[PDB]
Amino acid sequence: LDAVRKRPGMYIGDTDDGTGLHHMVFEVVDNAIDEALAGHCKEIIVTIHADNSVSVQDDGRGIPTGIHPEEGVSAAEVIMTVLGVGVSVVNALSQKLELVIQREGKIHRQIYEHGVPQAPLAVTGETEKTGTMVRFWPSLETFTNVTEFEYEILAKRLRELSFLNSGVSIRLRDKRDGKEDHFHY
Numbered sequence: 001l002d003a004v005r006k007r008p009g010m011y012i013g014d015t016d017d018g019t020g021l022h023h024m025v026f027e028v029v030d031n032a033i034d035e036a037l038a039g040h041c042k043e044i045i046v047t048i049h050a051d052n053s054v055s056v057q058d059d060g061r062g063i064p065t066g067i068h069p070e071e072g073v074s075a076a077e078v079i080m081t082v083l084g085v086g087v088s089v090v091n092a093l094s095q096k097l098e099l100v101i102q103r104e105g106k107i108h109r110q111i112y113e114h115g116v117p118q119a120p121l122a123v124t125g126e127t128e129k130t131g132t133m134v135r136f137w138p139s140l141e142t143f144t145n146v147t148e149f150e151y152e153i154l155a156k157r158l159r160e161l162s163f164l165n166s167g168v169s170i171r172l173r174d175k176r177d178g179k180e181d182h183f184h185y
């Protein structure tokens with residue numbers, strides 16, 4: 001991820017005017033929509049948290065957790081740490097990122113800081129559900145001037161995506177003021 005850290009604007013977009021900041025959400029959402037499409041219920045939930053982080057959840061199968069035979073770490077960690085720009089870019093540019101995967105009866109969790117895994121992906125409990133959740137806190141070392149998520153910028157794009165990905169339910173929630181929307185074509 002050092003090439004991303006060196007020139008963040010070249011991967012994510014302008015880091016001063018809010019472009020890049022919002023693109024971080026859109027990259028995660030692209031992956032969440034792919035995941036939701038391969039499941040039965042087909043819903044994603046995008047939440048703006050009061051602490052300026054965003055989470056994106058899907059109810060798909062869960063991203064793969066098994067050890068990548070070449071890289072020797074979980075497949076999930078490979079996706080997060082190896083170079084759509086890819087979620088690894090989001091991870092590199094987040095001061096914190098939390099990954100939760102529900103798959104094959106188990107909850108799996110991992111935390112990253114500035115793209116660095118804090119421990120290996122780990123099984124933390126049991127579950128009947130399936131899906132993936134990524135929550136990220138954008139790095140305020142990278143993102144300047146515009147540092148807070150604008151609801152309407154996210155809403156506009158999710159609306160466009162709902163028409164293109166018809167049959168996928170998209171929920172948007174703002175925990176700062178309780179604003180919410182439901183896009184479903």
Ligand SMILES: CCCCOC(=O)c1ccc(O)cc1
Binds near residue numbers: 029132133
């Ligand atoms: C089968 C591998 C799919 C790759 O998925 C992702 O990179 C991913 C990232 C963030 C999400 O919220 C969901 C999936």
